[PDB]
Ligand binder design. Sequence first.
Ligand SMILES: CCCCCCCCO[C@@H]1O[C@H](CO)[C@@H](O)[C@H](O)[C@H]1O
Ligand SMILES: CCCCCCCCO[C@@H]1O[C@H](CO)[C@@H](O)[C@H](O)[C@H]1O
Length: 388
Amino acid sequence: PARGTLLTSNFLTSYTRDAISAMLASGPEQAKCNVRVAEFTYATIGVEGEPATASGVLLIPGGERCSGPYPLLGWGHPTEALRAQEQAKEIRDAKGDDPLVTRLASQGYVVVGSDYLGLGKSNYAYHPYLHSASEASATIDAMRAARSVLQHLKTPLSGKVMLSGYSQGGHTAMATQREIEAHLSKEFHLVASAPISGPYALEQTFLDSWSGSNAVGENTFGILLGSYAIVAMQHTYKNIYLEPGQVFQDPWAAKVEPLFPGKQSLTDMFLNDTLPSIDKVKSYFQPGFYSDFPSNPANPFRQDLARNNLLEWAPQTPTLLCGSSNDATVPLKNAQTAIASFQQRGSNQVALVDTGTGNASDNSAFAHMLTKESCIVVVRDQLLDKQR
Ligand SMILES: CCCCCCCCO[C@@H]1O[C@H](CO)[C@@H](O)[C@H](O)[C@H]1O
Ligand SMILES: CCCCCCCCO[C@@H]1O[C@H](CO)[C@@H](O)[C@H](O)[C@H]1O
């Protein structure tokens, strides 16, 4: 089947604008649109270009005071370690109380997000965590399938397309932006891109926080995120190890691969200390690997990270990188580094916005989860709204 072919689809539920405004008051801006929640599966490609399937979520706004046409916003979700997790069902289970619904779809934005290869109803054997090409291919094809759904429902689209995403989703959003701008500008009239708290300077991000802490603070969840990265990069490039023991010490070597993705969420793992805390990193990674990474640019894992940097290009679309200076998980430095190379490449289309407190006393790995909704609102108001 051609990339983007819609395989299955169906509505899960719907929320009235009043019901959405109630959520907002409870959590005050008012919703303007009702939000229909749909799910779907489509045909796409694997990391080698081979056929694969993936699932996705589609939020459709509607209502008397919300006539179209609507802009199409592609969305990249954050790091997901639970293999069976489906965004659409999560929103439905959350009773529609999700920023995608309360902050975007309720304001007239059609939202489409892929669960990514290896997650949700995807048939991929693993998830290519932080792999630019497949994060982009999965998102692009999700938007393709969603358009088929929308065309069948006669949903009026303006034709304008936009991108956004949080955490790993910020990486996804930017990777998609780059791919569309380089090859699909006709098919996708991209008018705005707003990556949120993403590791655009991927390799730099891991190097800067390799010891366990960075200029901002302690990268508390780094062992979980780095382990997911190592395992995923191994599945994709198969150049890191023959078996887990070359990188991880026992007893984790034999448990790490089934975890990413697996039966546990990142939160489960952190709370039950499935993996050691950053203070015991030297007891976690093998000594050879741990010292080779920061001292050898040819290190296999480091090369795989570099291959997924999103720095060497010139963005053409008005871009708003959002994050917080308090964020110690994904330093806002990522945005600065990105912007510096973009300009150095002739592009002045990318701006940066900080939602931090300004008090280094608020610096924490935990500030990362706060940028999701804070940045969705800011990015919507300062850029998306302007470009629709
Ligand atoms: C969505 C992208 C998130 C990137 C998070 C990077 C967090 C890096 O965190 C670091 O990881 C290293 C390797 O595991 C560890 O050695 C360090 O102790 C840890 O602080
Ligand atoms: C970037 C991924 C980090 C995973 C480990 C930390 C998980 C912390 O738990 C998170 O706390 C947030 C509030 O602070 C909640 O909004 C999230 O639902 C919850 O999963």
